[PDB]
Design a binder for this molecule. Structure first.
Ligand SMILES: [Mg+2]
Ligand SMILES: [Zn+2]
Lengths: 1316, 288, 66, 251, 54
DNA sequence: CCCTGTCTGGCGTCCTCTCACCCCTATGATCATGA
DNA sequence: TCATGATCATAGGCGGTAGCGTGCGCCAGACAGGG
């Protein structure tokens, strides 16, 4: 079955793979993150409650006072979104917090407080998010963009090759906390182990192991095994486990049990280890040279002298053995220090250590942190407990603790946010294990190590920084005042909190201005994974590897939509199905392929769970049950594609559209384009502009409805029902009774957004697309937006294209367009410019906006009214007067030189106290009248719905067929009816009606207050006049058009109609492209799009022929059914036998300008299907029609390719780039011309052009190019007199900026001069 | 990747093949970005080191120039003599091998007719005057530069050649990239250069030098093959002989450095004391 | 090398218009070094004719009248 | 500079000089009223560090800032590097009598001429038109001539066709790589708003027509017209200076 | 300003939250032990003037 | 004094176009209202 | 008439009784460490 707007124009759909998971709501990152941020969240985390429970309770400097936390609450905003964008306020909500003050007594902090006080306090204004997913900061709609950064936890990197120039790789182990001090363990080419804290000075690593109160005996107990030597009657025998001897060449003949096992000069084989462990050999015999370099573990003391025999971690010599042998020790514990197995890295590290106990280690750490000051044991304890071991200054998140347990092979993924002793010891153990040769290092670009922050987490962090500044103020004030006399709003002030959050949302590196000229550009700017910003890398520094697609971007981050230029691969865009995990990583759906059958359950995999399993490719053929029809199937195991068996697979992809993003899944035939041209096509499809009447794509991907409905430019119905009143302003839906609340009678009113300014100076319009009396369903479009049509997404328009060289006018990439295109007004885009004029406050008095103006006459002032402001509707030229303004000297606002327009909307804002002039009172009466009429129509329309409910209830149960309309309509309650649900319902509707009456009274009073009041404004401004010009820019030689595949081009000549190549029917082609761009720039998808567009228009022409002849609905039903079946096993399977002879005529009314065809991305329409659809129309099979010429009237040889391509106009127009300057203004500090176009400036004759004129022999051209034309002021006035008198001659002089160089060098101690 | 892309753009590409194509494409785009970033700075440093050199005289008055020979990597001759000695003033006057007969005088610009008359007589090495061996104080004379490139005649007195030179070197920096035996092909006389050779017992010619360079002199004088010959290599031929095509004339071992001798006699050990100077390591699984 | 060959000149304005300006101006400050405009880029700085094309004939005239 | 809001976001230099004068006046007052023995030392350290912030900020240990993270600009940051007087104001300058627009093809041109709009040719060539007006006697002063060419009356297009006729302009593509990147043409007036540029010539600019933008300059003086005709004309540079290959290869 | 306190056991960052803190008289990295010349041999002064500076 | 490692200074394309942003918080003084 | 409270206007450089910094990289030449 189909929805009623899907019976208007049902898009033909090729495609073979039956879908199982539809496209999710495309704005779920922004909305879900900010819903996670601001919501009443119990059990502590996440949200604002995490900040308010981690920075509170503020306890004082031992004054026994404490400011603890209760709850919070956000009130309603004073301004809704529309008034906020008009006036210019933030769209914020006040953050009320309930704080409590308690004050303890003397001698008992575990005793009773004498007095508490709990109260409401005001702090900050956090800006809310609109339903589109955007913020309104100062009247300009802004987006905060998700950041891709390093995951907190341990990270074992390897500084490969480059250091020490000898190939010896290093290994470092960066512990990355979420908030606190970093910690980098590393090696050096002497194979010592070095710690460092926050990239500061370097210490040997075991100095922190003493700082955790470990003795050296315990350290060697941890980081090494033991070797036991027993002195038993002969040559100091040894306990030997032969696994340590795997490949070691002994120094003697190892024999045991009267049997020679190992010979001198040979090594111990593995089978000799098997012999020694099979015979269970324990004690072997060593020479005196064997313990010549063995390292003792613990301290041995002589019992008689009380001295030290040998210190810990010391090699043993002959005299040390002679001392400890005669003291009474039979057991000797040493360490195993092999070449391959276990290096003595800990032992060499302890030999570099000068420290000896806990205190000296804490002193040295306190000295490397803060240099050159007296340490004290209390200060060293406090610093080292506040580096890693305090809840305040150090905090891994849950993400950090998960990565730190997972990368150390733990079990519990839950732990504390602070470190401990076992954590650092496990980091050093894993680092030594990586140095030993077992285990692997971790790459950086792997998406199991890249977390995604969003709006909620970054706003929480900035709010937390505001709170630690305010706890730095409350700790100041709390124990330095008289108690009890103050309340907790005199202490805490809202300036740092609001300053922090307002600086983050106002100007950050990630809170950026929304590129809004297209529904696609909105919905793909909100889905952006930027690597830049705070905590990430920078553009002009890094690098190589991060600008490259890793093998685990498959289905998380789009590989082909990224901006080319200085930041490729850093401004990644997130894919279609890609959600965000609980912790912040990326996850993507798959289908659990149990042992034979592809089960239709979806199952979200992260980036590290994907690697262990094995995933089938998306388009693998399966026969109606899930059984894979091949016995070799293409899969990918561990980041590496291969060919696997039938039933060793564990997952299949969901749909074939999931590698790409929503920018580059509206490209039909994407699998035929080379990836560079698909990148340029997706980026230019983002850069489109909305035309006047947007049409539709004939060749789409079916993804248009998700991008249109799941954005916020169309007016989606909330509750379905029957339309009651359509208008260009408003739309009224009457809600069906099986969707309807019992109370609040309810018929909905959609106030559309008519002609208003976007951010890119386009024209964001909404047009109603429903008829009257028409049913609508829940979840359905009512009003099309900009670049939409019937709920689809129509960016550009589809035109008749031919690929042929035509007389050179399409030489490199140019485009040649018939005048039939510009006559139909079909690229005529509508732009809106906002021109502001402020009435400031200066000396000699304030300014005047009135029209009594000097130096002007009738010809200027005829287009102004009697109070200076231009009319609404006056079509002005470039350089007239819009607002007349004179200062205590003409300073009237003028149209900037070049642009026409029609003044559509004038706003006047008045700072309160200033006299409103007559036009400001006219606008006040106008908006009073509009808001009065609008709220009165709200009351009338909802009262009409309420009375219709009363009529619907009184059909039964005491019905009065004639007596109902004899009495006035406001008394439909006291009629004959007992105590039932109906009199209860009439009482509830009377409650609703009296609520509407008193609500209408109070809301009309509040709206008169909002219109009548002034507005807070800039320091020293009287009134602001804003005027909206509405230019209509058509098309001309110089604009940029482009298709959807990377075929760019400046349109080069707008030919007449007659010159166009026509065919043997009569129709001229509209646009003549260039064929030579196809084999080099390998975008072969545009030719398949051209042929399938010609097939679509062939079906449309046959419908137009079968309908223009007034044929009955039977033949239309026949032909539309044949055009909708037409293919292989497909998904569509429609039938017109359930459309009932009236929808088929209206469906053919919508198909007569062409039949829309969906072609999904990697499961598209093959060549034979295009041929069979070109055979259904009577077009030629090869797609090529023979074409005549317009000039000569004789045939082009070798018939050419025509069809329809869907081409977009880009907003790089030519009357926004063109500029010229004879003599304008000059800069102030260096007397050179200004830069730019708005400032009337000159083009930079840069350095390489100076080199290119030195490279010729042009000497006078360069002399006037940098002395006369540019800098020397007396030289250029002499030049201007000489040019207007006909004498071409220059008096050179000196550049004045060289005198500026002399003054800047001379302002140092340097004495530069000019000799002779 | 060991499993290639068996699908072209006229047919489809499925998802993994298009993903691997994306690996290649984004690697290329990032190469072009950082490539431009280095290329512009290379042009800057070259036009700031040259910057000053102006053709300021008309004849320096020296003779010593550089020797232009066609470059020989060891295969086909890559850059011939016509494309190197095109338009540059000769250092010493070229005498054809009819010795004491002058072919060109010693200050003649070698334009295209003279280059064809060089190619006909198969002239070995036209010694020619270079900019680096000039004599003009504070500048470069006109005759040592050569033809005015981009024009036809000799260079005008004045055109700043440092700047056009530095732009001509740094301008194709956008196009650049960023990140056993001797087998003969042709036939001719055999030349050896910097060789110390001796006769083995087999009758061949063995070499006692690393600095040996083999050359193939053709029928008219020049050289079409050159080969760096290693130390102790064994030639199947000698100097001045004649070979045929496809004939490997030399063989050696790239793994072993041969310590071959000159005189024929017994071998004894001098200053070779066992245990210290030489050690006893018996090859276990072979025997020798 | 070309960056050291360009920083080691007898003319401090060329070596100042190239890389580090601090070291070049301090060395030329304590040495009392005296540029004489010597070629192309100093004359592009100071605003007069290049001694390359037509300005080469002008500079031969100017130097001949010295 | 005023920011038109009642306040002056000052330049960094006045901040630095203000800090030196504050610290110096406080040091004069502390040497006046006697320094507490081993005390007249911290203030001189502060003055030395403020002067070292003024002459070269950031060379001594951690630099200063006004707002917020960015270190502010001393004198050596005005002479050195990019954004300084050697590379931004003295070696490459902003230039009057110049303009820029988007290029296009127009193959009906001879190779020594390019299309150029009527609006750009009227705004580049203004004082030439003023001189021809008061030389032919169609405006008494300069102000009547300026208001005539602002109204664009029917006679100034004949003046403009009489001043374009034998007067070259310089076309320039924005990344000039080698010396063929600046060439000189003789303009032809075009109804439209783009620069029609001969196709063969676009082999030397490395310029396609997918949105490229080129800038035109005007040679004012007489010697510069002769240098843009004899030295830099588009018919003269047909050979590259890198080799002997022609640069007019048909593309 | 002259203040009497004791460095090590009472560490400074705890006391930082208050005034009296720009930093020690140093003439060097370490907080320099200052003389108390006024306290010891120069108690009572300011006969310079009461100029009330400027 | 003769290496050999560390440290801190230099440097990292051109041209153009668009947009926002460019103190708020605390203390003191004056005026008005209430007792 | 006096006192207290509230509102408005005018005036300066981590904010705090610490700690923030952490994702470039190469070359080069001086300063110093080890022997
Ligand atoms: Mg291009
Ligand atoms: Zn010479």
């Amino acid at each position: 079955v189909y929805s009623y707007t899907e019976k208007k124009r049902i898009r033909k759909d090729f495609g073979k793979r039956p879908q199982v998971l539809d496209v999710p709501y495309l704005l779920s990152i922004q909305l879900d993150s900010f819903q996670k941020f601001i919501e009443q969240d119990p059990e502590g985390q996440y949200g604002l409650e995490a900040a308010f429970r981690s920075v509170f309770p503020i306890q004082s400097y031992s004054g026994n006072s404490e400011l603890q936390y209760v709850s919070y609450r956000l009130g309603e905003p004073v301004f809704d979104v529309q008034e906020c964008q008009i006036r210019g306020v933030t769209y914020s909500a006040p953050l009320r917090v309930k704080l409590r003050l308690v004050i303890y007594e003397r001698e008992a902090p575990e005793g009773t407080v004498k007095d508490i006080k709990e109260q409401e306090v005001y702090m900050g204004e956090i800006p809310l998010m609109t339903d589109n997913g955007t913020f309104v900061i100062n009247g300009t709609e802004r987006v905060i963009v998700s950041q891709l950064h390093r995951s907190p936890g341990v990270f074992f990197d390897s500084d490969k090759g480059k250091t020490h120039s000898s190939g010896k790789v290093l290994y470092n182990a960066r512990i990355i906390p979420y908030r606190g001090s970093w910690l980098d363990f590393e090696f050096d080419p002497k194979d010592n182990l070095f710690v460092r804290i926050d990239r500061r000075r370097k210490l040997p690593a075991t100095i922190i192991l003493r700082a955790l109160n470990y003795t050296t005996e315990q350290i060697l107990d941890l980081f090494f095994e033991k070797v036991i030597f027993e002195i038993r009657d002969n040559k100091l025998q040894m306990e030997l486990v032969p696994e340590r001897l795997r490949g070691e060449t002994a120094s003697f003949d190892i024999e045991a049990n009267g049997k020679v096992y190992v010979e001198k000069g040979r090594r111990i084989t593995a089978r000799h280890i098997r012999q020694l462990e099979k015979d269970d050999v324990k004690l072997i015999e060593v020479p005196v040279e064997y313990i010549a370099g063995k390292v003792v573990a613990k301290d041995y003391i002589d019992e008689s002298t009380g001295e030290l025999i040998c210190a810990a971690n010391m090699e043993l010599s002959l005299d040390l053995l002679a001392k400890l042998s005669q003291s009474g020790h039979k057991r000797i514990e040493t360490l195993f220090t092999n070449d391959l197995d276990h290096g003595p890295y800990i032992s060499e590290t302890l030999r570099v250590d000068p420290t000896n106990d806990r205190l000296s280690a804490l002193v040295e750490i306190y000295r490397m942190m803060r240099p050159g000051e007296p340490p004290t044991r209390e200060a060293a304890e406090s610093l080292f407990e506040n580096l890693f071991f305090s809840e305040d200054r150090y905090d891994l998140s849950a993400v950090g603790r998960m990565k730190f347990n997972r990368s150390l092979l733990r079990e519990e993924i839950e732990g504390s946010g602070i470190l401990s002793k076992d954590d650092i010891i496990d980091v050093m153990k894993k680092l030594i294990d990586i140095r030993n040769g077992k285990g692997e290092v971790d790459d950086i670009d792997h998406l199991g190590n890249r977390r995604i922050r969003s709006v909620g987490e970054m706003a929480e962090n900035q709010f937390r920084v505001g709170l630690v500044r305010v706890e730095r103020a409350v700790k100041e004030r709390l124990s330095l005042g008289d108690l009890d006399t103050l309340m907790p709003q005199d202490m805490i002030n809202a300036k740092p909190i609001s300053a922090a959050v307002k600086e983050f949302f106002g100007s950050s590196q990630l809170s950026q201005f929304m590129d809004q000229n297209n529904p696609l550009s909105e919905i793909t700017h909100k889905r952006r994974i930027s690597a830049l910003g705070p905590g990430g890398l920078t553009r002009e520094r890094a690098g190589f590897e991060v600008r490259d697609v890793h093998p685990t971007h498959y289905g998380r981050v789009c590989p082909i939509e990224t901006p080319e230029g200085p930041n490729i691969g850093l401004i990644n865009s997130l894919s279609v199905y890609a959600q965000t995990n609980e912790y912040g990583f990326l996850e993507t759906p798959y289908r659990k392929v149990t042992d034979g059958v592809v089960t239709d359950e979806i199952h979200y995999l992260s980036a590290i769970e994907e690697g262990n399993y094995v995933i089938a490719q998306a388009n693998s053929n399966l026969d109606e049950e899930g059984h894979f029809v091949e016995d070799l199937v293409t899969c990918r195991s561990k980041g590496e594609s291969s060919l696997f068996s039938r039933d060793q697979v564990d997952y299949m992809d969901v749909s074939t559209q999931q590698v790409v993003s929503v920018g580059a899944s509206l490209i039909p035939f994407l699998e035929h384009d080379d990836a560079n041209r698909a990148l340029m096509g997706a980026n230019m499809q983002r850069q489109a502009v909305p035309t006047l009447r947007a049409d539709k794509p004939l060749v789409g991907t079916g993804m248009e409805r998700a991008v249109a409905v799941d954005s916020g430019v169309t007016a989606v119905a909330k509750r379905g029902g029957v339309v009651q009143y359509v208008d260009a302003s408003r739309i009224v839906i009457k809600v069906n009774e099986d969707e309807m609340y019992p109370g609040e009678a309810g018929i909905d009113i959609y106030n559309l957004t008519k002609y208003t300014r976007s951010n890119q100076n386009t024209c964001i319009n909404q047009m109603p697309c429903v008829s009257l009396g028409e049913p609508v369903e829940r979840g359905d479009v009512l009003a099309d937006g900009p670049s939409t049509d019937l709920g689809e997404l129509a960016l550009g328009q589809n035109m008749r294209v031919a690929f042929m060289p035509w007389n050179g006018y399409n030489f490199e990439d140019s485009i040649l367009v018939s005048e039939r295109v510009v006559q139909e007004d079909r690229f005529t885009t509508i732009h809106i410019q906002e021109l502001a004029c402020v009435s400031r406050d200066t000396k000699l008095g304030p300014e005047e906006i009135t029209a009594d103006i000097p130096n002007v006459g009738e010809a200027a002032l005829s287009k102004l009214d009697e109070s200076g402001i231009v009319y609404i509707g006056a079509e002005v030229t470039g350089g007239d007067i819009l607002v007349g303004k004179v200062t205590p000297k003409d300073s009237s606002l003028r149209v900037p030189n070049g642009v026409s327009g029609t003044v559509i909307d004038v706003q006047v804002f008045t700072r309160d106290g200033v006299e409103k002039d007559k036009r400001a009172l006219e606008i006040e009466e106008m908006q009073l009248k509009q808001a009065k009429k609008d709220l009165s129509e709200e009351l009338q329309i909802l009262e009409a719905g309420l009375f219709s409910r009363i009529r619907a209830v009184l059909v039964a149960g005491g019905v009065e067929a004639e007596k109902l309309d004899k009495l006035p309509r406001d008394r439909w309650l006291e009629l004959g009816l007992t105590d039932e649900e109906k009199q209860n319902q009439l009482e509830q509707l009377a409650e609703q009606y009296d609520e509407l009456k008193h609500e209408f009274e109070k809301k009309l009073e509040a709206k008169r207050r909002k219109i009548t009041q002034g507005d807070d404004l800039a320091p020293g401004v009287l009134k602001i006049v804003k005027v909206y010009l509405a230019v209509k820019r058509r098309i001309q030689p110089g604009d940029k058009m482009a298709g959807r595949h990377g075929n760019k081009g400046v349109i080069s000549k707008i030919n007449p109609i007659e010159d166009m190549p026509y065919d043997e029917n009569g129709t001229p082609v509209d646009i003549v492209l260039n064929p030579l761009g196809v084999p080099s720039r390998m975008n072969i998808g545009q030719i398949l799009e051209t042929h399938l567009g010609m097939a679509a228009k062939g079906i449309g022409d046959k419908i137009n022929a079968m309908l223009k002849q007034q044929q009955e609905v039977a033949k239309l039903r026949e032909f539309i059914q044949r055009a909708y079946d037409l293919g292989a096993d497909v998904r569509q399977k429609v039938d017109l036998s359930t459309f009932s002879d009236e929808e088929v005529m209206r469906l053919a009314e919508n198909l007569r300008k062409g039949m829309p065809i969906a072609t999904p991305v990697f499961d598209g329409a093959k060549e034979a299907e295009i041929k069979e659809l070109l055979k259904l129309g009577d077009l030629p099979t090869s797609g090529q029609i023979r074409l005549y010429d317009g000039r000569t009237g004789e045939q082009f040889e070798r018939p050419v390719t025509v069809g329809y391509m869907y081409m977009l106009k880009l907003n790089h127009l030519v009357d926004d780039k063109m500029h010229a300057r004879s003599t304008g203004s000059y800069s102030l500090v260096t007397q050179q011309p200004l830069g730019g176009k708005a400032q009337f400036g000159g083009q930079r004759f840069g350095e390489m052009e100076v080199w290119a004129l030195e490279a010729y022999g042009a000497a006078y051209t360069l002399q006037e190019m940098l002395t006369v034309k540019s800098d020397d002021v007396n030289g250029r006035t002499k030049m201007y007199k000489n040019i207007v008198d006909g004498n071409h001659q220059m008096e050179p002089g000196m550049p004045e900026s060289f005198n500026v160089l002399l003054k800047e060098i001379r302002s140092l101690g340097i004495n530069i001069e000019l000799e002779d | 990747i060991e499993t290639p892309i068996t699908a072209n753009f006229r047919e489809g590409l499925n998802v993994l093949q298009y993903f691997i194509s994306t690996h290649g494409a984004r690697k290329g785009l990032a190469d072009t970005a950082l490539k431009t970033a280095n290329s512009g700075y290379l042009t800057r440093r070259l036009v700031d080191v040259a910057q000053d050199l102006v053709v300021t005289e008309d004849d320096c008055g020296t003779h010593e120039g550089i020797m232009m020979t066609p470059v020989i990597e060891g295969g086909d001759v890559k850059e011939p003599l016509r494309d190197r000695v095109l338009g540059r003033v000769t250092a010493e006057d070229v005498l054809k091998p009819g010795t004491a007969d002058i072919l060109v005088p010693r200050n003649t610009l070698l334009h295209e007719q003279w280059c064809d008359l060089l190619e006909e007589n198969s002239v070995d090495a036209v010694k020619v005057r270079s900019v680096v061996s000039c004599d003009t104080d504070f500048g470069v004379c006109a005759h040592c530069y050569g033809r005015d490139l981009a024009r036809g005649h000799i260079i005008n007195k004045g055109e700043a050649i440092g700047v056009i030179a530095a732009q001509s070197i740094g301008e194709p920096g956008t196009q650049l990239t960023m990140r056993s035996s001797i087998q003969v092909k042709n036939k001719g006389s055999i030349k050896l250069s910097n060789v110390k050779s001796v006769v083995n017992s087999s009758g061949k010619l063995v070499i006692t030098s690393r600095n040996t360079e083999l050359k193939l002199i053709d029928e008219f004088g020049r050289t079409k093959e050159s080969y760096k010959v290693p130390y102790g290599a064994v030639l199947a031929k000698g100097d001045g002989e004649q070979v045929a095509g496809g004939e490997t004339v030399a063989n050696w071992d790239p793994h072993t450095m041969p310590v071959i001798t000159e005189v024929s006699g017994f071998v004894r050990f001098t200053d070779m004391i066992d245990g210290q100077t030489i050690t006893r390591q018996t090859d276990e699984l072979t025997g020798l | 090398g070309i960056t050291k060959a360009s920083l080691a000149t007898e003319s401090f304005i060329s070596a100042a218009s190239f890389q580090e300006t601090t070291r070049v101006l301090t060395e030329a400050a304590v040495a009392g070094k005296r540029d004489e405009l010597r070629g192309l880029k100093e004359n592009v700085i100071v605003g007069r004719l290049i001694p390359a094309g037509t300005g080469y004939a002008y500079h031969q005239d100017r130097m001949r009248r010295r | 500079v005023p920011l038109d809001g009642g306040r002056f976001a000052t330049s960094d230099l006045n901040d630095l000089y203000r800090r030196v004068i504050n610290r110096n006046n406080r040091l004069k007052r502390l040497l006046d009223l006697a320094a507490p023995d081993i005390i007249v030392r911290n203030e001189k350290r502060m003055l030395q560090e403020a002067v070292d912030a003024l002459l070269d900020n950031g060379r001594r240990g951690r630099a200063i800032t006004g707002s917020n993270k960015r270190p502010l600009k001393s004198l050596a940051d005005m002479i050195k590097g990019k954004q300084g007087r050697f590379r931004q104001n003295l070696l490459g300058k902003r230039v009057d009598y110049s303009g820029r627009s988007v290029i296009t093809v127009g193959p009906y041109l001879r190779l020594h001429q390019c299309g150029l709009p009527k609006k750009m040719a009227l705004e580049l060539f203004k004082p030439f038109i003023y001189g021809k007006l008061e030389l032919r006697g169609l405006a008494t002063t300069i102000k009547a001539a300026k208001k005539m060419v602002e109204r664009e009356e029917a006679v100034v297009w004949d003046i403009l066709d009489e001043v374009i006729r034998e007067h070259p302009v310089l076309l320039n593509r924005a990344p000039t790589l080698h010396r063929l990147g600046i060439q000189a043409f003789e303009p032809v007036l075009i109804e439209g708003k783009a620069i029609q540029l001969h196709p063969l010539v676009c082999a030397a600019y490395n310029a396609d027509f997918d949105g490229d933008q080129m800038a035109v300059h005007v040679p004012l003086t007489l010697e510069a017209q002769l240098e843009a005709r004899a030295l830099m004309m588009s018919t003269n540079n047909i050979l590259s200076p890198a080799n002997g290959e022609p640069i007019i290869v048909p593309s | 300003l002259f203040v009497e306190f004791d460095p090590e056991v009472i560490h400074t960052t705890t006391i930082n939250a208050t005034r009296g803190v720009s930093h020690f008289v140093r003439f060097g990295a370490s907080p320099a032990i200052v003389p108390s010349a006024v306290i010891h041999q120069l108690s009572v002064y300011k006969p310079k003037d009461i100029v009330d500076p400027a």
